Amino acid sequence: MNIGLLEALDQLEEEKGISKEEVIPILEKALVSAYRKNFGNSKNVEVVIDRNTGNIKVYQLLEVVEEVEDPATQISLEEAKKIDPLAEVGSIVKKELNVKNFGRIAAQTAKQVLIQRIRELEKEKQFEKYSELKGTVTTAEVIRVMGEWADIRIGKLETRLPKKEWIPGEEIKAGDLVKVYIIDVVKTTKGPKILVSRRVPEFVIGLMKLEIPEVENGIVEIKAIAREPGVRTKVAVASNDPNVDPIGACIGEGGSRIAAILKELKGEKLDVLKWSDDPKQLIANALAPATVIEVEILDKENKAARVLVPPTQLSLAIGKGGQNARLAAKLTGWKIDIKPIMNL
């Protein structure tokens, strides 16, 4: 490809919106560089791309002085006045330098520049797309794992998934494909950077949207959630469609859906329960497998209640380290106290 510089420039400013006035200058300076690292490094040269033809012009600069110390950089006022405009000591004087064999080189450095300009446009294009992924869950590939973070890959982009943000207790190794939640996408003065987490509660929601269509749809709504990453998540759902059972849509065909969810959560426990406008029933739904007999709303004001359960389900209702009641408490917003019936 000969010069053909104007060629691409016009095609680019129309194919990718990149202004040629932003490129010519960057290119002109790179050409001086190319001419130097290619031809001699003796002459102080300047390069100008003709805006009507794109033909590259190359001028040798010279200081018009009163001496002859360095012919290569200086010129008397008689050698100057002549060949060039009406100079004066301490002025500009550009001798054009007809010189072939540069056409080749110039083309290459032009290619480079155009590509670097494109990569920049592309970078601004990454931020556009990937911001649309904000608030969703997407699979990512773990490139490497270092102490406090793992470098993961999402599409053409790459970010860190800090260890502080992954499931407390989990292991992640290079080559792994882990799902992450996009908190936000930010424009960093070094490419767009996607903020991700597998610990945040929206992660569980994100997973549900994937494995469960009606949740992506809206046919099954997630009314409430409470998550203690690594240990347990309780999530309350409802169907905006009385034809679909919220729970059934979540458990899935032979339980393949919570199965996929649970696996992704490693050891984390997940409780899927029906939401209810009736606090007493909500609470009862939140105490998971324990069977509640009655909820005693001893404060319809400060949202506090007493729950009575069968003796043999007292510790089950409460849970290891009391995680069941605590999580049901966070999910409902009510303070709950569990008690065995008939026996103090």
Nearest-angstrom CA–CA distance, 35 and 178: 49
Q: Which helix (H) or strand (E) holds 337?
A: strand 335-340
As a whole number of angstroms, the distance between CA 6 and CA 234 comes to 63
In this structure, is the dihedral angle defined by the CA atoms of residues 241, 243, 247 and 253, taken in order, positive or negative? Answer: negative
Count CB atoms within 10 A of the CB of residue 65: 17
Q: What is the dihedral of CA 134, 137, 138, 144, to 10 degrees?
A: 90
Q: Which two tokens stand for residue 232?
A: 């347990």
Question: 19 exposed, middle or buried (CB, 10 Å; 0-12, 13-18, 19+)?
Answer: exposed
Q: For 208, phi and psi rounded to 5 degrees?
A: -60, -40
Cα-based distances in Å from 146 to 71, 163, 186? 59, 9, 23
How was it solved?
X-ray
Burial (CB < 10 A; 0-12, 13-18, 19+), residue 289, is exposed
Q: Which residues contact 247 (CB under 8 A, 6 or more apart)?
A: 237, 272, 273, 274
- What's the Cα-to-Cα distance from 228 to each of 35, 232, 293, 329, 333, rounded to whole Å? 63, 5, 26, 12, 15
Q: Could you tell me which CATH number the domain at 198-276 has?
A: 3.30.300.20
What resolution in angstroms does the PDB record give?
A: 2.5
Whole-angstrom distance, CA of residue 338 vs CA of residue 325: 8
Which residues have C-beta within 8 Å of that of residue 289, sequence separation ≥ 6? 316
Q: Nearest to residue 30, comparing CAs of 101, 92, 102, 99? A: 102
Return the ∠ at Cα 267 (arms to 239 and 290), rounded to 5°: 55
Number of Cβ within 10 Å of residue 293's Cβ equals 14
Please name the residue that has the structure tokens 């469609």.
241
How is the chain split into domains, by residue range?
A: 2-125, 135-197, 198-276, 277-344
DSSP 221-233: EEEEEEEETTTEE
Q: Domain 2-125 is classified in which CATH homologous superfamily?
A: NusA, N-terminal domain (3.30.1480.10)
Q: Tell which residue, 309, 301, 296, 308, has the closest CA to residue 333.
A: 301
- Classify domain 135-197 by CATH architecture: Beta Barrel (2.40)
Distance of alpha carbon 123 from alpha carbon 77, whole angstroms: 51
44 burial (CB, 10 Å; 0-12 / 13-18 / 19+) is middle
Rounded to the nearest 5°, which phi and psi values hold at 60?
Answer: -90, 130
DSSP 8-state assignment for residue 60: E
The reply to whether domains 198-276 and 277-344 share a CATH topology is yes
Spatial CA neighbour of 289 closest among 302, 272, 307, 305: 272
Rounded Cα gap, residues 251 and 237, in angstroms: 12
Q: Which residues pair with 143 in a beta bridge?
A: none
Q: What is the DSSP string of 131-193?
A: HTTTTSEEEEEEEEE-SSEEEEEETTEEEEEEGGGS-TT----TT-EEEEEEEEEEEETTEEE
Task: Name the strand (E) or helix (H) holding 279.
Answer: helix 279-286
**16 Cα distance to chain centroid:** 23
Architecture of domain 277-344: 2-Layer Sandwich (3.30)
**Spatial CB neighbours of 256, under 8 Å, sequence gap ≥ 6:** none
